Design a protein around this ligand. Sequence first.
Ligand SMILES: *[C@@H]1O[C@H](CO)[C@@H](O[C@@H]2O[C@H](CO)[C@@H](O)[C@H](O)[C@H]2NC(C)=O)[C@H](O)[C@H]1NC(C)=O
Ligand SMILES: *[C@@H]1O[C@H](CO)[C@@H](O[C@@H]2O[C@H](CO)[C@@H](O)[C@H](O)[C@H]2NC(C)=O)[C@H](O)[C@H]1NC(C)=O
Ligand SMILES: *[C@@H]1O[C@H](CO)[C@@H](O[C@@H]2O[C@H](CO)[C@@H](O)[C@H](O)[C@H]2NC(C)=O)[C@H](O)[C@H]1NC(C)=O
Ligand SMILES: *[C@@H]1O[C@H](CO)[C@@H](O[C@@H]2O[C@H](CO)[C@@H](O)[C@H](O)[C@H]2NC(C)=O)[C@H](O)[C@H]1NC(C)=O
Ligand SMILES: *[C@@H]1O[C@H](CO)[C@@H](O[C@@H]2O[C@H](CO)[C@@H](O)[C@H](O)[C@H]2NC(C)=O)[C@H](O)[C@H]1NC(C)=O
Ligand SMILES: *[C@@H]1O[C@H](CO)[C@@H](O[C@@H]2O[C@H](CO)[C@@H](O)[C@H](O)[C@H]2NC(C)=O)[C@H](O)[C@H]1NC(C)=O
Ligand SMILES: *[C@@H]1O[C@H](CO)[C@@H](O[C@@H]2O[C@H](CO)[C@@H](O)[C@H](O)[C@H]2NC(C)=O)[C@H](O)[C@H]1NC(C)=O
Ligand SMILES: *[C@@H]1O[C@H](CO)[C@@H](O)[C@H](O)[C@H]1NC(C)=O
Ligand SMILES: *[C@@H]1O[C@H](CO)[C@@H](O)[C@H](O)[C@H]1NC(C)=O
Ligand SMILES: *[C@@H]1O[C@H](CO)[C@@H](O)[C@H](O)[C@H]1NC(C)=O
Ligand SMILES: *[C@@H]1O[C@H](CO)[C@@H](O)[C@H](O)[C@H]1NC(C)=O
Ligand SMILES: *[C@@H]1O[C@H](CO)[C@@H](O)[C@H](O)[C@H]1NC(C)=O
Ligand SMILES: *[C@@H]1O[C@H](CO)[C@@H](O)[C@H](O)[C@H]1NC(C)=O
Lengths: 653, 510, 137
Amino acid sequence: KIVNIGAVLSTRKHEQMFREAVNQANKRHGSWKIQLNATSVTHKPNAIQMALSVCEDLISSQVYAILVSHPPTPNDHFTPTPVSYTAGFYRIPVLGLTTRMSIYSDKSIHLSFLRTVPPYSHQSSVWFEMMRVYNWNHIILLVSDDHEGRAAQKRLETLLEERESKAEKVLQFDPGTKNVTALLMEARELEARVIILSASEDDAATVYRAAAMLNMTGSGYVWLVGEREISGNALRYAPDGIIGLQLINGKNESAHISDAVGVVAQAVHELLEKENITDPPRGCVGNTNIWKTGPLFKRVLMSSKYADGVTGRVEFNEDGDRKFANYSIMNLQNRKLVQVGIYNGTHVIPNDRKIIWPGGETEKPRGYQMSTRLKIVTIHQEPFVYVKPTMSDGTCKEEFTVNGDPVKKVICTGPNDTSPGSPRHTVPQCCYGFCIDLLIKLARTMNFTYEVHLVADGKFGTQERVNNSNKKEWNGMMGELLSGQADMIVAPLTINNERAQYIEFSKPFKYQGLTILVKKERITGINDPRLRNPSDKFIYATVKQSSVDIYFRRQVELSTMYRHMEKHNYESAAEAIQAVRDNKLHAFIWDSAVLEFEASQKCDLVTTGELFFRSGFGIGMRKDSPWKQNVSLSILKSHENGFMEDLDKTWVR
Amino acid sequence: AVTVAVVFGSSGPLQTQARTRLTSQNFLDLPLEIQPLTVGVNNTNPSSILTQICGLLGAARVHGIVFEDNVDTEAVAQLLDFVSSQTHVPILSISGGSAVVLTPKEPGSAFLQLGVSLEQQLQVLFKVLEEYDWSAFAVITSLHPGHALFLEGVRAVADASYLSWRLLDVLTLELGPGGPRARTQRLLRQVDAPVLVAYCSREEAEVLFAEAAQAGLVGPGHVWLVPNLALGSTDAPPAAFPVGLISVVTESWRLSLRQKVRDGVAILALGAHSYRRQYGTLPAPAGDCRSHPGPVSPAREAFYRHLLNVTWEGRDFSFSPGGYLVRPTMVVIALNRHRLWEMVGRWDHGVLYMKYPVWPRYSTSLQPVVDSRHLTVATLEERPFVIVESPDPGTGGCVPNTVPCRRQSNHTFSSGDLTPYTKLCCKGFCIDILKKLAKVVKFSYDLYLVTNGKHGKRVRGVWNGMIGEVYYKRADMAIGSLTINEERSEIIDFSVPFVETGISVMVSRS
Amino acid sequence: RHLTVATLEERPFVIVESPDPGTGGCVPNTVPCRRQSNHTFSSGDLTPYTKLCCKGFCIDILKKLAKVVKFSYDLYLVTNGKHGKRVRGVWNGMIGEVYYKRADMAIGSLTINEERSEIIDFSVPFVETGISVMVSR
Ligand SMILES: *[C@@H]1O[C@H](CO)[C@@H](O[C@@H]2O[C@H](CO)[C@@H](O)[C@H](O)[C@H]2NC(C)=O)[C@H](O)[C@H]1NC(C)=O
Ligand SMILES: *[C@@H]1O[C@H](CO)[C@@H](O[C@@H]2O[C@H](CO)[C@@H](O)[C@H](O)[C@H]2NC(C)=O)[C@H](O)[C@H]1NC(C)=O
Ligand SMILES: *[C@@H]1O[C@H](CO)[C@@H](O[C@@H]2O[C@H](CO)[C@@H](O)[C@H](O)[C@H]2NC(C)=O)[C@H](O)[C@H]1NC(C)=O
Ligand SMILES: *[C@@H]1O[C@H](CO)[C@@H](O[C@@H]2O[C@H](CO)[C@@H](O)[C@H](O)[C@H]2NC(C)=O)[C@H](O)[C@H]1NC(C)=O
Ligand SMILES: *[C@@H]1O[C@H](CO)[C@@H](O[C@@H]2O[C@H](CO)[C@@H](O)[C@H](O)[C@H]2NC(C)=O)[C@H](O)[C@H]1NC(C)=O
Ligand SMILES: *[C@@H]1O[C@H](CO)[C@@H](O[C@@H]2O[C@H](CO)[C@@H](O)[C@H](O)[C@H]2NC(C)=O)[C@H](O)[C@H]1NC(C)=O
Ligand SMILES: *[C@@H]1O[C@H](CO)[C@@H](O[C@@H]2O[C@H](CO)[C@@H](O)[C@H](O)[C@H]2NC(C)=O)[C@H](O)[C@H]1NC(C)=O
Ligand SMILES: *[C@@H]1O[C@H](CO)[C@@H](O)[C@H](O)[C@H]1NC(C)=O
Ligand SMILES: *[C@@H]1O[C@H](CO)[C@@H](O)[C@H](O)[C@H]1NC(C)=O
Ligand SMILES: *[C@@H]1O[C@H](CO)[C@@H](O)[C@H](O)[C@H]1NC(C)=O
Ligand SMILES: *[C@@H]1O[C@H](CO)[C@@H](O)[C@H](O)[C@H]1NC(C)=O
Ligand SMILES: *[C@@H]1O[C@H](CO)[C@@H](O)[C@H](O)[C@H]1NC(C)=O
Ligand SMILES: *[C@@H]1O[C@H](CO)[C@@H](O)[C@H](O)[C@H]1NC(C)=O
């Protein structure tokens, strides 16, 4: 039994190296009777003629495995495709030595394909590690629209989703298209200062020139790119201080040939014990069935720890890709590509030199540039946020407390519009109260300026399925905070699990619960049989798109509760209270903090039962906002000294 | 005029080739008469395929190529895609084998498969599950290449649906010829799910069904659903396939080879005619292997787009950018009692046409009898215990915690043998008890209301009501407001009482 | 996935008991806990740690968290100071154990305040509290 392997090369000289390497491999092994044989063929220009060349010689001979290399001149995924298809027809394993494209990782297209070199997509992994090293969280994924960009983005998103994080935004750059300036203009607005690029040489050069035009290469920014973006045309126009990376061996054909023949021989020896070896198809013509042993040969070849190779230990993952690697990190320091570290496979190891960031700084920059002018959204809640009309001169009535203290007021832009339906005019008013006083204290403590505006639709916000679609989208202050119109929510927003997945909540600044308001006392909580057996006799309702809606919708035990509620929800809390007092609605379920104040001030109404959902009000921010801790600390401090007691006494008597 | 070529590989009779060009004097219905060309490979291997396509290209200037294969051929699709990418010739795959959708195409590809993707199949299967209200299912996938796309599709369809789709368990098996017998029986032994969606190839499907039969997972109480990957040559299915297997195919599944060839020729002819009527000139024929084009010519990119949106004989054949068929008329088929694949429902335009109001189950695979875990539960309506209501109009079906109950037949006008039922949604105390019982004892049930009598009364020697239904083997059990007394215990067996009642008298205190 | 949880006895929330001698172990719905092993109670080779059983509100919350987040955990009490106070710039108690990485997390009657929230991280409060005055009627 003579086990023959084959190779398709280009240089006509590396085939002699492959013959030498296979001869050495034959000189060392368990058995020496298999008489390992080798054959080789040079590359052909025509792809169809190339595939026919694979069918002849290689396939015609009794070959067990095929190796394929790539000519030095970059031609991308064009040369190994025909041999991969032809050998995958018979499930004959094909080992790639220099190709880097991720299209060959898809086992649906290329069935029997393994590679000894990681693809371009795997680079994203090291980026994650770097993001762990420097604690960067806000990133932008500027990736091409081709398969490579989609694969890199998908892998990075998978890694990020394994952890608790998410990329700020991705930007699809269509290959070969000029004017990428729109994407850079969009990315300049965002808070993230870490730019990640995945594109070819021409695309990388184009985006580098466009970013130089937009001055996005200055101080504070961080650029992380791949191998294709620090070579060829890209390196010429690349801005200084970018951090790229490159594989250690990369193009050392001889190392990848020796390391491949060693593992192939080890695999052959390993599976030869079980025998049941089926001879190869012996020619494309005269056979239409796959080689039966082929699948098992590939399966045993994938799990083969050949830890004596030129390029280190060889191991393959579930998709037939070389598990580990070593990436050298490159910095463009004064037009020179200097090495500053080596990625062992799980952690980057910095040994010598110092990273020079693009702005010229010698100190690690944080990955965000939080602005000073802060847009803050708020809603109209009577005990917390009083909204009053401003006089014709642009400021509203001056007022003082009963004790004799000046009431601080700010200017806000609310939905006041004479036109019916939606708000069609944002006429300014003046806002004050508990939340605005807290906001003023917070802004004084944290040294930032603010612009306060009211929510567009008068709702707190729950995610709901968008019309003519199947996905759910947020609305209200929730939607405006997530979209970007507002940067912080200072309002009585109830903390709950649904909102905490997308919004970051500070420490609660007001503990409260949910209670029931009726006319001025035969209701005990939400467990009374009348409230468990809905009917026209006792009607109960809440505010649409609020925390109570979410609470009842997320309860399996209270489905009928929400079913009855859905028929009578109200636009706002104030109109619901007015309807209840006027004997148009029987019971109104709402927060204790507001309901108790309404019952105390306006009287003629009573709160019944004990609080059945204890929660707190919190300042809402975008996910992973850098200044969450600040605010939380301040809130805790306000609880400690005297501030929340004074705010309670002054506003909610 | 237009040259359209037909390629073969299904082998079979050799005379059909002549007919393939005899139909040359049949396309008079189609405008812009077409000259066909018939050369068929009989070894379906890469060398012969490439050489014959080379010679066909070199001999006569062809405008489009139609390919057909029999079944279960994997790598032919990649070869056709490679040839289309190289020679820049619009190919069209008909019949099966090479019609399985190959999702990521090459940038210059013009494969244009006449198949339907995995996402659409999963959409239709989930629609069927919604129609039969099977909220809790389990997904069984092999290590066949492509199971990742299947898992992504099922997750996407589950997320993109109004219903609260429950995914009980996802378990990956290891099938194959012989292989590792163990580690599959143990895993299949502890999957507690009434409906299973499987994804595997034909041989893997056969092995999985055999193992499930050995694992007590087939028969009534277990509904299997598979995409076309498990089905092979639907003319004759293997014996290992269990009765009640459900799949979704395209409309052309019942067509013959000649009809499919005619449809492909019509597609190419209509594309060429649209191109001619738009540009005022006949489409440019393709070349050959030498002098590869490189950048796709603007004419090619226009002929391809014209070929994309084509409608013929009512059915629409619009092609997605990926190369498969978007919004086709799909048919949901199933394996019947006589082990023959027959149509059960259609899809048409976003609306399901199921011919079974209630999914039937058969005595097949009932070797230990105990496998008949399925039950039929007769029930009545009493305001405190069991209450029915109309289905919720917003999302169809029912509200959570509400079992679907079908009223007995359609007595209002169909008071006869006619089986069709009428759906309602049942809830209450007794329904909660029945749900808990089915959860604990691990059985499935078909809840249905009673029309003859109310609770049971011996009239002229026969029993009506729920007692009548149970006593006459029409229902395995009856739950509701059924009082235990001596006359009923003598003919049927009750259970331990779960709520104490009696005879009581009500008056007016006013 | 194995978290090391530090805690301290607080009658309403954390209760420590000796295990039942009759059955060897202790009553279910009671998580086994160990006492700090600084002082060796081995007395040769028997056991270097005092094995008690902990129960109460906080332990119930911890069990629910272990079920939901799907993690495993041990549990040991703190014998170096109370809940925690900075003395000479160092921290003792539960805050000391967590800050110096001796334990993954601390559960019990631990109040959120600024001085602790600066040095360590805190989760969302699960029971509200504060300063209160007790007088005899
Ligand atoms: C061992 O490999 C050598 C590789 O050269 C094979 O020699 C080739 O054999 C094929 C088929 O007979 C011929 O078409 C080539 O011309 C041969 N090449 C040379 C350089 O002689 C040899 O046949 C193999 N031994 C086997 C298969 O037993
Ligand atoms: C890409 O196209 C946009 C057009 O939307 C160009 O934007 C204009 O650029 C000029 C000069 O830079 C400005 O005076 C205009 O105000 C811009 N218009 C807008 C709407 O922004 C942009 O310059 C183009 N870029 C390239 C590289 O061609
Ligand atoms: C690929 O790598 C190998 C080893 O990593 C290189 O082999 C070295 O070659 C030089 C001269 O060519 C010798 O002086 C060294 O002793 C060799 N290394 C060893 C370990 O023996 C080989 O040159 C590399 N090929 C390329 C193209 O860079
Ligand atoms: C990356 O480089 C390191 C060298 O620092 C390689 O580590 C070698 O690993 C082999 C086998 O595991 C050992 O025999 C060597 O002693 C190691 N080198 C040193 C200096 O300790 C590592 O294998 C490389 N990574 C890969 C994937 O090859
Ligand atoms: C609060 O922020 C303002 C603006 O960022 C700070 O004012 C700057 O102060 C520095 C020196 O402290 C000056 O060099 C800048 O020119 C000032 N800018 C402006 C616009 O006034 C202010 O110092 C901050 N308050 C602090 C740090 O307590
Ligand atoms: C939270 O507040 C602290 C103050 O205790 C901030 O720490 C200071 O931050 C400024 C600028 O970020 C630095 O110039 C000071 O040196 C920091 N002080 C110390 C003692 O380190 C902290 O930055 C705030 N958090 C955020 C996100 O801004
Ligand atoms: C099928 O698609 C083609 C191209 O998308 C349509 O061709 C267009 O026809 C209109 C008028 O008939 C022209 O104004 C467009 O310029 C054409 N698009 C091109 C040339 O790309 C064709 O009309 C579609 N079929 C039908 C029935 O509408
Ligand atoms: C090897 O093949 C024989 C039949 O030729 C079969 O009985 C045996 O199980 C096989 N062993 C394997 C596949 O390990
Ligand atoms: C609110 O809108 C009305 C109608 O446009 C307008 O008359 C009124 O002046 C507005 N309020 C204020 C404070 O300007
Ligand atoms: C909203 O969806 C409905 C379908 O429920 C559709 O009829 C209507 O046109 C859609 N409206 C808009 C503005 O898309
Ligand atoms: C296949 O080749 C030709 C088809 O043109 C046929 O005549 C021949 O008999 C076939 N050879 C076989 C089936 O071995
Ligand atoms: C009721 O059953 C009859 C029996 O065939 C059927 O014709 C009718 O359509 C059914 N009505 C429904 C399902 O509403
Ligand atoms: C350990 O125990 C000793 C008593 O033996 C006492 O000093 C203290 O509790 C601990 N000492 C430390 C932690 O240094």
